[PDB]
Design a binder for this molecule. Sequence first.
Ligand SMILES: Nc1nc2c(c(=O)[nH]1)N[C@H]1C(S)=C(S)[C@@H](COP(=O)(O)OP(=O)(O)OC[C@H]3O[C@@H](n4cnc5c(=O)[nH]c(N)nc54)[C@H](O)[C@@H]3O)O[C@H]1N2
Ligand SMILES: Nc1nc2c(c(=O)[nH]1)N[C@H]1C(S)=C(S)[C@@H](COP(=O)(O)OP(=O)(O)OC[C@H]3O[C@@H](n4cnc5c(=O)[nH]c(N)nc54)[C@H](O)[C@@H]3O)O[C@H]1N2
Ligand SMILES: Nc1nc2c(c(=O)[nH]1)N[C@H]1C(S)=C(S)[C@@H](COP(=O)(O)OP(=O)(O)OC[C@H]3O[C@@H](n4cnc5c(=O)[nH]c(N)nc54)[C@H](O)[C@@H]3O)O[C@H]1N2
Ligand code: F3S
Ligand code: F3S
Ligand code: F3S
Ligand code: FES
Ligand code: FES
Ligand SMILES: [Mo+4]
Ligand code: NA
Lengths: 823, 235, 118, 135, 135, 117
Amino acid sequence: ANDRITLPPANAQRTNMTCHFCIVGCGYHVYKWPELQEGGRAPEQNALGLDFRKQLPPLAVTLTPAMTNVVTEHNGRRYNIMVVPDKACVVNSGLSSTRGGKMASYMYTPTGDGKQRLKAPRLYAADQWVDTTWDHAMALYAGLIKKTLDKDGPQGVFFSCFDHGGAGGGFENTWGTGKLMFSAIQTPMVRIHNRPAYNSECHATREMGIGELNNAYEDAQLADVIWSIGNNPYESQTNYFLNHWLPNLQGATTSKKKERFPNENFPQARIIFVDPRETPSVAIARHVAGNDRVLHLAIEPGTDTALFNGLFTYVVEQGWIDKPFIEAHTKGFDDAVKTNRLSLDECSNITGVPVDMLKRAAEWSYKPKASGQAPRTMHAYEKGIIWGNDNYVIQSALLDLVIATHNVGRRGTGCVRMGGHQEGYTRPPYPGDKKIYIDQELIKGKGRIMTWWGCNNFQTSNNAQALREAILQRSAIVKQAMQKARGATTEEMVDVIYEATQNGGLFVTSINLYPTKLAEAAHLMLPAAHPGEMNLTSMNGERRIRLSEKFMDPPGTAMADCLIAARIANALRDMYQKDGKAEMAAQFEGFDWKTEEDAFNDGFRRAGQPGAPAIDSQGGSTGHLVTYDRLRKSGNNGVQLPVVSWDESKGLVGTEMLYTEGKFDTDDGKAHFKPAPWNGLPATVQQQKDKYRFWLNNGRNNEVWQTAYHDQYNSLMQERYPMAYIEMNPDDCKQLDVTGGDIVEVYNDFGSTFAMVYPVAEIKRGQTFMLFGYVNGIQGDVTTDWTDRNIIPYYKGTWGDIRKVGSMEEFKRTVSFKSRRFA
Amino acid sequence: NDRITLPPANAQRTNMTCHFCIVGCGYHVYKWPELQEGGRAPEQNALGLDFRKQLPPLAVTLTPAMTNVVTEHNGRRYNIMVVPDKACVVNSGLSSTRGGKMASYMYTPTGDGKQRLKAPRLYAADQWVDTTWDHAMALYAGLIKKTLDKDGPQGVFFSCFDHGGAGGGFENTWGTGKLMFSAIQTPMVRIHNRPAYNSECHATREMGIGELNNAYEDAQLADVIWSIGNNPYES
Amino acid sequence: NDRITLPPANAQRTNMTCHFCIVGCGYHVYKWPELQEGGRAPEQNALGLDFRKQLPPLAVTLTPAMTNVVTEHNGRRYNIMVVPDKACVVNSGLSSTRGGKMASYMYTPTGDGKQRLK
Amino acid sequence: AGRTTLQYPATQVSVAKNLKANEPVSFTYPDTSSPCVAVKLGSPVPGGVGPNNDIVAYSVLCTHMGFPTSYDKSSKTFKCPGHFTEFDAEKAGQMICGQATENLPRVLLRYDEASDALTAVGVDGLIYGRQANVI
Amino acid sequence: AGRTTLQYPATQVSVAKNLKANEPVSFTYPDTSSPCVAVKLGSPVPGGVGPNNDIVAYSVLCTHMGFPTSYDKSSKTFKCPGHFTEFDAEKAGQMICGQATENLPRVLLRYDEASDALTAVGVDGLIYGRQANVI
Amino acid sequence: GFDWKTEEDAFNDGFRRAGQPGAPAIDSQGGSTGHLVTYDRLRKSGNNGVQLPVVSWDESKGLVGTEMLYTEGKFDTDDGKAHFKPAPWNGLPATVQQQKDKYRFWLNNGRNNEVWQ
Ligand SMILES: Nc1nc2c(c(=O)[nH]1)N[C@H]1C(S)=C(S)[C@@H](COP(=O)(O)OP(=O)(O)OC[C@H]3O[C@@H](n4cnc5c(=O)[nH]c(N)nc54)[C@H](O)[C@@H]3O)O[C@H]1N2
Ligand SMILES: Nc1nc2c(c(=O)[nH]1)N[C@H]1C(S)=C(S)[C@@H](COP(=O)(O)OP(=O)(O)OC[C@H]3O[C@@H](n4cnc5c(=O)[nH]c(N)nc54)[C@H](O)[C@@H]3O)O[C@H]1N2
Ligand SMILES: Nc1nc2c(c(=O)[nH]1)N[C@H]1C(S)=C(S)[C@@H](COP(=O)(O)OP(=O)(O)OC[C@H]3O[C@@H](n4cnc5c(=O)[nH]c(N)nc54)[C@H](O)[C@@H]3O)O[C@H]1N2
Ligand code: F3S
Ligand code: F3S
Ligand code: F3S
Ligand code: FES
Ligand code: FES
Ligand SMILES: [Mo+4]
Ligand code: NA
């Protein structure tokens, strides 16, 4: 049915759903109704309240076939679903991105895009994939972990697990997994989904006293200037950019600035991008605001620290700083002035940005307005610097600038992460005292068992080729050992596998929605459930916690990850009880959980309460005031964390902006400046740059979500992006005799991978941009092993050569190579 | 008393011609919530004037008579400031004593405008009372209708403004004139300042010279000015 | 609006019986120059009340309606405050809505008494 | 100084959509000794805020002699147990009957559509037992 | 009628030979509230009609939130001013970049060699802001 | 013809219709170019407005009007010429003269600077 849609009946069930994907956390409604009912076209005869008796005007709805589906429940009954944006949600005001817009299509149905969802335990029984029971899966998995604990201790048990929010994260799930890994198993051999150790993206800003989500989305409406540093927000944080940033650039929020601040000038809002690449976000900002209100600081790759040290030096020398703020609320300023000193000429030589542009950015951002107040300058950053040239140092440099200019704690300011996933962290403390580079450990032959949980590092590790090589080989040893068994009990098989891991083998488990490329190495795969198949809580980039309501059943025996963790814990407890080991059994207590809500009560709602163990929670110690029922009453607007108060008549009252009284998260309540040395690129990256021609920039496409775990099954997505693409300069293209839809090898000392050629006029000569994380042509093969002091990778820092494989005529027939930069 | 609330930098600013005399001096009306105020620094108030120190002569025209607090239909209170426009060609920032009082003569419940008519008033034989607009129209239209039906238009009399400014102007003279002349069609109409429907300027118009035939700039270019039957410093 | 000028400690105080009904409640009239005021500390104002912190119920009857600025025959301007006497046996510090407005209904050129026959 | 205005704090009350029709919310403004109520009336009134222009807020201290008044949900009034003054929540604190000489003071709320927030930003009228609203 | 198809009208657009390369023709289909464009691209494309297999036609309403898109002759694309979605006229309405979850709907044209007529006879995809293409 | 919701409607109906096609007879100080004036155009003009009659309008120029009347010698009469008139001196009117004959003082009258009307 291409040319019509079944309307939701007026009385259709409606539940709340936060978007599964990106940080912004847009609010949606899920309409659910029996397959053989429909709404009428009259606005009072359908659930949308829209008049389908005549054409709707623009902006009246977001509604396509991709936003509809028919689900088949565990009882065999069929129900229409419609997943559409909430017009009254403050986050998105009825906007839907292309990614969230596909939620309905990516819900589980037996015939649709979710048809290959994991529905039962899968086992690679030496030489073939077969189903197995949950009890056999637990006996084998628990069995191995138990054997490893008994013989090697926790250091033999490895995880890479999500720490994020939204789908495949959230407060229930991070608690469940963390409780299992850290309180029960007590393994330190744990990495995170996007980085190869147990660390933070935001060590420097946190240690300086500024948590990275310190403002409201409303702040982007109130700003004079917005910086977007290492950040492509139209593509990566769409509806924050569309619903909040653009209205400011258009002048729609001016009256609200003036109402808040009667005696302050508000010029036209301007936007500054720090990005080596001219992105869609740069183009669209120019289209909306005019070229005169956009500054693209097209820095040389890796030179962000030089940029910020030059701007900091200049604003200090001009006196464009808040000296009363510095004096009352900060420590270390005078030291930072000395350590970070860099002239605009030196800054220009390093960055490649002309001195006029450096001065202009400072004049827009820091020079007092005519009324006497500093500009309200919101500094927004993401992975261009988080995966940049020395994560810790860039944040040090940037924060120094922000603190000196009092661009934290004022409305219309903030130095924030734009975010990736939603947030939803509640976990015990990490049980080690050392940073551990998990990938390197695995590649060196450590560990008996490795579990990928809600992540796929074959596609997303730095130095991903070294990783896959090692894991495939180690998996093979286990497969070969399993093959000699005939008629073995589970316990005998556990011994067979364990022995294989003493000869270089590794048992691999994946806990997932889908097989993924991890199926090339995995011995065991367990089915998980996503939001709508379960209740799930999470918060967005302004700390707004929402409940995503269950409205349908998972596929087969798929389970919420927190309940998978409880399953594992209880299997281990039972084995220890059976083995007469009361002390070891006791470590696996506390997982008597029947629904996801129990994990919410056990984690988020216990943080900082009397008799609670140490819990690190984004909800803080007032987490207990949030209940599922209270979130339901709040709607898609939720509450900004931390919660300050609750009663029946008021609801949840929370916190708009952090640090508005100048009390920071440090020992003394002051924000702390840090030294930020410029040391160039890391030697390992510089070596690549010296040997090879092209900078291999990498990151997001608007349409593609992450490792394309859903998108790989979507015929539209596959027709548009059948292969990972690499944006190349047209002149570079002519020199390599390539054009749109040719395939190239991209390669260096670290790896070899493949991409389709995407000529892009806005790409600079000797620079490229490749889609990351993809199912066909994995970008990460060419990223280096280099990390900063806290084991944060410089994913955006690598160089390689490009060789033509040949012309893919089919790509040329079916794929658009036209410009993605709107003008 | 002895102080003034300054308009905030971002205060609302509208244009207002003086209510009163022919000169039509230009003013600005600053409007802002009662609980906000401007700062003394010139860039922190709407006037752009430096109230951190004494102002020189000619820098401003500003007294308490040029300020008020109005109460709107929503019950919310707003400071107003009614002051001459410096860049208006007519007056170049001058305010007469009459126009200078405009803020004071805006309607407020407790001020000089306190006895403004706020509803229809009816003298019901032996006492003043309020009445509704519908009752007022039923009585007034009713009478006019009865008079038209029995006496024709010649039973219905008016004396009405024909002038501009407050209590006149193009919208108002059209409205009244269309009513009196096109609809009711009564000739029994006089003007505010004279007891027939006539002109002050019959002779000069019939001689071919309408009476407002120059610019104020012409008073700047003249060798000689005659002021005939005219007290122009006062009028 | 949102504030009141306190009577100075040394403010003149006269006796006034309510203008209106039979009960004849007792009031005090505080009179002082317009450009002077009392302090919030209880010993620095004529009421003897502590305006450095919220007052409890029954501590006072005082609103802007109970205050005025009169212009005397000499042209000089004086704050007045017309408030019930706490020690009068008739009313024990009570003011009705009618007596409570006496300050407002004193003659001033711009106030409620503006149309007084002169 | 210069300044002719009191320095009112900006105090978050709640988001508008949390308020139920005719179910009063308690808060303090402009300090913890000044009890206030905000109520969604359920029907627009002059100067009401929020999506249905119907949220109003008051000081609950009687402007006669300062007893905390109580919101009656059935009449939408504030009633004083001292000398039986009653104020209309739907007429900006107009005194229905009583001994006060001042309307119940209104707490001025900003309503922000973007956040759904209600912030107390000022007071119209003088709170009982105070020389100025801001101590 | 247990009919499974919509009742599309047959609407004459023009004769093919009146179309100039890359010069869009505007028309309404399947009713006057549905703006459409037909363009001769100048070079054959999959499913193009006419003598050079190069004439294509589309609904111009953005499948995101319904703003009329504009045909850009330099790129042969349709660009939406609302949230910057852009469709390829040479790849059957493929979204190049944007927030839509559906390609630009194609107006299906019959081309009659006998008459040189181009007739709109159907739509492939769902037109913005409609329960069905035929209201 | 009084379907008016705001004062602007009266402006559109009167001033802006003078001398337009299908208009009834209207005597306006704006003349027949009054339609070029709109509230939004006057707003853009500021307190300077425009001297009537308006001669031209466009978005780039604004309202352009008329400084002085009769600068080319064309007057508002049948022939375009200014017309002299006889002006006899007849003394005061007998009604006024009778007052002057009976009573002492000439009772001149008019304006005070401070008092409006
Ligand atoms: N070169 C390069 N590499 C990068 C980056 C870069 O910029 N450059 N970016 C890094 C970044 S910022 C990111 S976040 C990472 C991401 O790397 P990963 O975390 O490996 O990638 P995702 O696609 O987020 O993985 C989510 C996985 O969990 C599954 N899943 C989805 N929902 C659920 C659920 O409810 N439960 C379970 N158990 N599984 C679920 C999906 O099918 C999928 O396999 O990649 C990093 N890698
Ligand atoms: N459409 C879509 N949106 C997503 C995702 C997705 O997969 N698809 N993933 C989500 C996740 S988990 C994340 S982490 C975010 C990421 O959101 P962003 O980090 O905004 O996206 P990226 O494309 O990784 O990189 C941002 C920019 O970094 C620039 N960059 C590269 N090297 C440097 C450098 O040395 N310095 C500077 N200053 N900039 C540099 C690149 O040119 C690029 O435009 O997006 C989230 N949103
Ligand atoms: N302050 C103020 N200004 C006003 C007004 C107002 O009320 N107050 N009203 C406005 C209006 S509506 C008008 S019409 C104008 C009035 O403006 P004017 O006409 O300027 O004012 P008047 O005071 O009526 O009279 C002008 C002069 O006529 C003189 N006069 C008396 N009899 C004769 C005579 O026989 N011949 C001659 N040649 N002169 C004689 C008087 O002495 C007097 O000074 O003022 C306007 N401006
Ligand atoms: S629809 Fe989804 S992908 Fe982000 S922009 Fe909104 S949370
Ligand atoms: S201020 Fe008014 S009274 Fe005449 S002189 Fe100017 S128009
Ligand atoms: S009116 Fe009567 S009750 Fe008292 S205050 Fe006045 S004597
Ligand atoms: S204290 Fe309230 S009516 Fe007297
Ligand atoms: S309405 Fe067309 S891109 Fe959103
Ligand atoms: Mo990420
Ligand atoms: Na086998």
